[PDB]
Design a protein around this nucleic acid. Structure first.
Length: 96
DNA sequence: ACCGGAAGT
DNA sequence: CACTTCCGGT
């Protein structure tokens, strides 16, 4: 599993709204408990020293890969680049 | 908080 | 590999 899928997963179940939530359509989300989002991600990936600093670094690498952008000026808020994600899932299957 | 290089896995 | 680790810098 990958980090964007993970966040999508957390976001699909609105029962996790205490730690992450959609923030108006469409693509923007805010982590309402970024440490809790980080400890769940490390728990998932078997990396128990995962924190928000390290998580957000991984999000920043998504920037140049067109998967994610920052919502500038809003705390713990990012934006899915669905176009970039679509581009990738599609070129993936075309190729193999 | 957020950026991004650099090196590790 | 797709992150993780660490950190100087803003």
């Amino acid at each position: 599993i990958q980090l964007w899928q993970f966040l999508l997963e957390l976001l699909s179940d609105s029962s996790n709204s205490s730690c992450i939530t959609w923030e108006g359509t469409n693509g923007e989300f805010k982590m309402t408990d970024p440490d809790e989002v980080a400890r769940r991600w490390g728990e998932r990936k078997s990396k128990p020293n995962m924190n928000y600093d390290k998580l957000s670094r991984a999000l920043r690498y998504y920037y140049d890969k067109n998967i994610m952008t920052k919502v500038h000026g809003k705390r713990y808020a990012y934006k899915f680049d669905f176009h970039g994600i679509a581009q990738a899932l599609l070129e993936h299957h075309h190729h193999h």
